Amino acid sequence: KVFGRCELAAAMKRHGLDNYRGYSLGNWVCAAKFESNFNTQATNRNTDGSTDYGILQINSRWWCNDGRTPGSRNLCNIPCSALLSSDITASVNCAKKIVSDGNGMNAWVAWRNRCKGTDVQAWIRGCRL
Task: List residues with catalytic annotation.
Answer: 35, 52
Nearer to Na ion, 39 or 65 (CB): 65
Q: What are the C-alpha distances in Å from 26 to residues 16, 100, 116? A: 13, 18, 11
**Hey, what's the torsion of the CAs at 12, 33, 77, 60, to 10 degrees?**
180
- Interacting partner of 69 out of Na ion, Cl ion, none (Cβ under 5 to 8 A depending on kind): Na ion
Q: What are the C-alpha distances in Å from 63 to residues 1, 98, 101, 129? A: 22, 8, 11, 29
- Interacting partner of 104 out of Na ion, Cl ion, none (Cβ under 5 to 8 A depending on kind): Cl ion
The answer to whether residue 104 forms part of the interface with Cl ion (CB under 5 A) is yes
- Cβ-closest residue to Cl ion? 104
Interface with Na ion (CB under 5 A)? 60, 65, 69, 72, 74
Residues 36-95 that bind Cl ion (CB under 5 A): none
Provide, rounded to whole angstroms, the least separation between the CB of residue 17 and Na ion.
23
Residues at the contact surface with Cl ion, assessed by CB under 5 A: 104
Residues flagged as binding site: 101
